[PDB]
Symmetry: C7
Subunit: 281 residues, 7 copies
């Protein structure tokens, strides 16, 4: 029953991504440089990498990064998510992976982006599991489709997962997703950037202090912070539409939005990433 493969031009750019300067640069070095300086790669000899795996807690910009990089390269973007993998897994129809790769090859230059890579693992038991090993029909197909996919087309693959412990190791061997990259929770400074980025296209009241909001937040992932802004907006809109029946999103809106701030990632989980992040890096 496989959904339809949608190529698209990534709407998002580096400006919408708070922080992660280091990876932005590193990403460019992995896709820009090989295409825009093929001369320098031929000069020094070394040939580029097929793909990258982002791992990290949820809501930290694994997707923004995959899209921004596509958009920066002015390239096409295909996004295969968890449920789509799982459909092929449940329906035994992993042959469609071929189709996905076709559509990316034909849409070259293209970043093909497998989000929620771990979702089959999870689906068969995850942490504990069933009988066999990390291999599964669908991811396995991805890996062939990746072995057979000539380095010299213009398709860049990016995987993302927030449960790298359960990912099949074969994904990481040379010639596949070689570059492990950890996208961590946002720090002190980064949370500021993330707020600014999230409010770039918004009428932020002058007084509202984000540098402070950033001090107020921790196990707060980008997603968590975006959630705050949105509640603040929804408050300003409801506060606007109220008065008529005057629009700048202001202090007391953020204040009252803060009354419902959650943290998606708990400390245990965070700890767990550092463990993953230690061996994995």
């Amino acid at each position: 029953a496989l959904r339809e493969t949608v190529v698209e031009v990534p709407q998002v750019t580096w400006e919408d991504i708070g922080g992660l300067e280091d990876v932005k640069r590193e990403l460019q070095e992995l896709v820009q440089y090989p295409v825009e300086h093929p001369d320098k790669f031929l000069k020094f000899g070394m040939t580029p990498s097929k793909g990258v795996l982002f791992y990290g807690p949820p809501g930290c910009g694994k997707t923004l990064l995959a899209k921004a990089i596509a958009n920066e390269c002015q390239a096409n973007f295909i996004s295969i998510k968890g449920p789509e993998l799982l459909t092929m897994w449940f329906g035994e129809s992993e042959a469609n992976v071929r189709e996905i790769f076709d559509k990316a090859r034909q849409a070259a230059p293209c970043v093909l982006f497998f989000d929620e890579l771990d979702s089959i693992a999870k689906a068969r038991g995850g942490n504990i599991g069933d009988g066999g090993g990390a291999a599964d029909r669908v991811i396995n197909q991805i890996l062939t489709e990746m072995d057979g996919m000539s380095t010299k087309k213009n398709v860049f693959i990016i995987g993302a997962t927030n449960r790298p412990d359960i990912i099949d190791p074969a994904i990481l061997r040379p010639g596949r997703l070689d570059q492990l990259i950890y996208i961590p929770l946002p720090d002190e400074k980064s949370r500021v950037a993330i707020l600014k980025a999230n409010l770039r296209k918004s009428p932020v009241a002058k007084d509202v202090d984000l540098e402070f909001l950033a001090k107020m937040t921790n196990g707060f992932s980008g997603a968590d912070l975006t959630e705050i802004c949105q509640r603040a907006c929804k408050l300003a809109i409801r506060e606007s539409i109220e008065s008529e029946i005057v629009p700048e999103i202001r202090r007391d809106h953020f204040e009252e939005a803060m009354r419902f701030a959650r943290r998606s990632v708990s400390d245990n989980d965070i700890r767990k990433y550092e463990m993953f992040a230690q061996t994995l890096q």
Copy 2:
């Protein structure tokens, strides 16, 4: 063997819903405002949400809310319930979820409402379960059909469950059912409203004291309260048809109706929802 997908116009409005003022407002803000004020959403930038998940104990108005909102927006309403999901699960026919989504897309503006979202979970063991993870072929389909369903059609998805502990987490990721909303048991005041709402289209004897009946009921859910009225009616009808072979539903009818008042939700369960409600919110 899939049943026939029935589009319909929701018969029920906010007046038939006792209490829940806060959510009613919140719901409007999620569906009315984006459609009737696209200008304000484009002004502040933020784009609306695809869907909502109501969780709560049974008989508290999760359906009334999904219908009232559709009716308020003067929109179509499709309802897929537990047994329908289970059919596709037993018959391995989840491809029909595509059909359901077509039917909703084609009937846009539409609220597509998946009640008893947890019923496959229960069916495969629930709390304890089988080998694998939360994923199952049918919900997974819903999820694809929801990824592939352009935000810009006019289809609004609402899930309902009373066993949110067993719902697949993927349902809650961004771009799906983002808005968790808890529909709790009705409180002191609310029970009054619910009784009034339930008796709006009825000859209530003047003396009959609802504010009191409300004090009399606790772990009483909206369903439970309705049940009382109905017994009161059935008593008045039986008491009417009796005299001939004089119609206003009166004090002693409710009194004798009360002699059979149950509570659908037990305190343990209630406690469990607060647990769910704590982490989940």
Copy 3:
């Protein structure tokens, strides 16, 4: 391999049912009143119920009731029993439930009556069971067919079970078999009515004291009582055909019939029903 669906006109009336006055009334209030007084239901607003679940020990008239009600309403009666459900279960042919529901809809006004509701439950392990939850492909089908079956046709559904502990709870949700009704063992007075009813069409000797027979019997179900009469008859018939090679069924025939009186329901079981009957009501 599904048997052939037989619509029929119920041969049996209230006179054949001993005792249960309360439920007889209640049953009428559930099917008569909505049809023969649609005006009063529209006046008070409340809309009628789709169906009813009788539970209780075996041999207490859960069938008699389902039939007599159909006959009173001068309606058609379809009976699906255990073995029929089991056939669909074993043959994986639950699509036939559809056909049954068609045949009912087409023979409207009709009481469709699913006796032995629990029989698949028993078949898969019952009290202890297999892996999964209460759902099974066949009952589930009944539930879809019932969700999809417009309230406004003229089909009234009635389930019966004597193992309501193993019934799938979904069967009891609103819009399904909402009305739980307990048909208990016959009491003191009831036993007399049941003997009278069973002998209505019989030459009972004048002396024969039933009010006494009633005192003699306890965990005696209607079925058990019928069994006595029958042995009494068989005794009179054998006693008759004897003399020739003089017909009124008399004292000493009942006396000698009593020499083989069993009780189908044991006290433990009975106790169990009260437990079921406590939570369930």
Copy 4:
């Protein structure tokens, strides 16, 4: 792969059956009286029974009874045995049960006799068993075919089993095999009858004392007793053919036949039947 259904006229009569006077009478009262005195059954009202279940240890005449009764009523006899049921079970072809019932219906008046009723139960594990409950596809089909088989045809069903503890209880509900009948090991007097019956068509030497042989035998079933006579004959025949290369089966033949007398039923088993016989009656 189902065997061919053979209608036949029962060769055996009451004379060939030793003892069991009580049941012979009872059997007649259950099949003769309703057919040859429909007037008396209509007079007293009571309607006849569809069938009967003999249970008992093996070799006690459960079969002879089923045949004699058919032959007395000058009726047709169909015999389905264990291996035939099992064939349908293994081959999943229970739909043939229909065919059998057709053949019986078409050959009416008929006794349809299911011997070794328990043989599926045994095959699946019996005493201990598999996962599920007493129901199985094949017996179940017998049960439908019997519900759907109008009381008013002329087909009388008889089941036999020596392991009633493992029979599905549904077989015993009203309208099915209502009449449980225990066919016990032969007693003191009966053993004499059984010997006489078995030798009715034989040249028994005048001196040979059976009343004594009867004293000599206990856990001896009809079958076991027959076995003795046969060894006696085989001895006389071998003793006859011997002399030529003079025929009356005599004392010393029985004497030397007794040197190999077995008892098919052991005391534990017998005990077990009394347990079954206690609750079951």
Copy 5:
């Protein structure tokens, strides 16, 4: 994949069978007498038996007996062995049993001989086993084909097994293989006969003392004895062909043949047969 059913005329006669005089006689009385003296069977009334089950340790002449008796009756002989039964069991092709029975019916007068009857039992686990009871699809088929096979054709069925503990008991019921016969290890005298028999068609040196060889051998079965002779021959042959590059099988050949004498059956096993033989007879 079922092998081809071969009818044949039994090459072997009573002379080739050492000992077992008692059963030879008994076998004749079961097959000769009914056919060559139908008058005497009709005179005394008793009707003959359908078949016989030989059980006992391996290499004791269960096959010779089955053949010799066919040959004596100048009849055809079909031999179905273990691997052939197993083929039907693995292949789920027990319907071929029908074909075997046809071929036998058509070749009448015939002894149909199912050797290694226990071989499916063994194959599913034997002594310990799998879930279910003694029934299996293949043996079951044999049983039906035996119930349906009219007594009045001329086909005589013989089973053999050396693991009667795992045989299905149904095979022993009346109308099937009624005659249990134990073929025990050969005794003192028998071993002599067996040697003579086995040497009937051989140049045995005059001096060679078999009555002694017989004293020398115990847990020796016919097969074991045969094995000796064979080594003795092989010695003589090799001793013959040697001299040229003088033929009477002599003392020192048996002597040196004895240096390799085994016993196929061990005392434990033997003990086990006596146990089987005790209850079974």
Copy 6:
């Protein structure tokens, strides 16, 4: 997916086999003598054997024997190996065993040679195993094809296994692979023969002392010894081709070849064969 059955003329003769004089003789007595002296077999009566099973540790000449014998008899040779059997096992295509047997029958006189007989047993768990008994669909076929294969064709069957403990016992019954033969590790003298045989077609330097090499080697199987020669050759060739850019394989080559001498069979294993060899012989 069965491989293609290849008839061939065995290239190898007794000269290429070191040691095993006793078996070579024995083998001849089992195939030569019956064919080249049918008179003597008819004279003494005894009829020849259908086949032979060689068991022993690996690399001891089980194959060489099977071939040499075929070649001596100037006969055809078919070799089915482990993976071929396993293919039929995995693919459920044991019907091909028929085809193999045809092809052998048609190429008669022929030695059909089933090497690695135990490989299915191994494949299903071996020592510990799965649920059932020794029987498996493929070996079982080989047995039928061997029962059905007339003694009087000219096909001689030889099996080989180094795990006789796990071989199905049925293979050893009379009329199948009756002759067990143990092919043990080569002893002191044998090792010399094996070296000479292995070097028969080689320029062995005069000085090189094999009788010594023989003293140096133990748990050394023929295979292991062969391996040494080969390393010696490879040394002489590399040592030859070296000098040009002089050929007799000499002392220091063997010396340096010895620096890499392994033993395929470990003492535990060897012990295990003696256990097998004890009961088995």
Copy 7:
């Protein structure tokens, strides 16, 4: 769903392989000598080997060697990797192995190279496993396709595994992958060679000391060393492109590259290989 079999000419030569002089030589002796000196192999008699199994820790040049050897012989190279094997395993399509072997046969002279030979073993549980033995449908097919593949075509098979403990032993029998070869972690000297080889086609700054880097690295595999160079390059490139918006990869680049050196193989694993390497050699 099997991927497309790609013949190719190996791009890589001995120069690209650091160290392993011994095996390079040994490899040539196994493929060159038989083809380029068929005269010398015919002279000494010995016939060449079909194939080779490299086992060792990951990233040590098992692939390089397979390729370099093909390239040296100026031959074609087919690479079947793990995921391809797994595809046939999951899809039960091992018949494609035939196709692979055809394509290799048709591309002769060819080295056919099965990398990750152990990947099914792993997939079914590996170290612990499932019920059965080492055999599996796909590898088994490889083995047949290797038995049937005439020694006299020009196809040379090479396996590679880093989990030789779980490899099916049958792969190692004569006539298959006879040559076990251990490719160990690179030692002291080797690491220098590997760095040089890895930088052959690179502008290495004169000062940069590799002999030192070699001292710095241990459980460092060729892959791990490569990884260092690459980070050094990436640093020089990033450092180059930086300055414009000057190219020789220099000291401080390696220095900073060293700040992220991992070791792919841990000491436990290393230990494990020595264990494998001890028995296996």
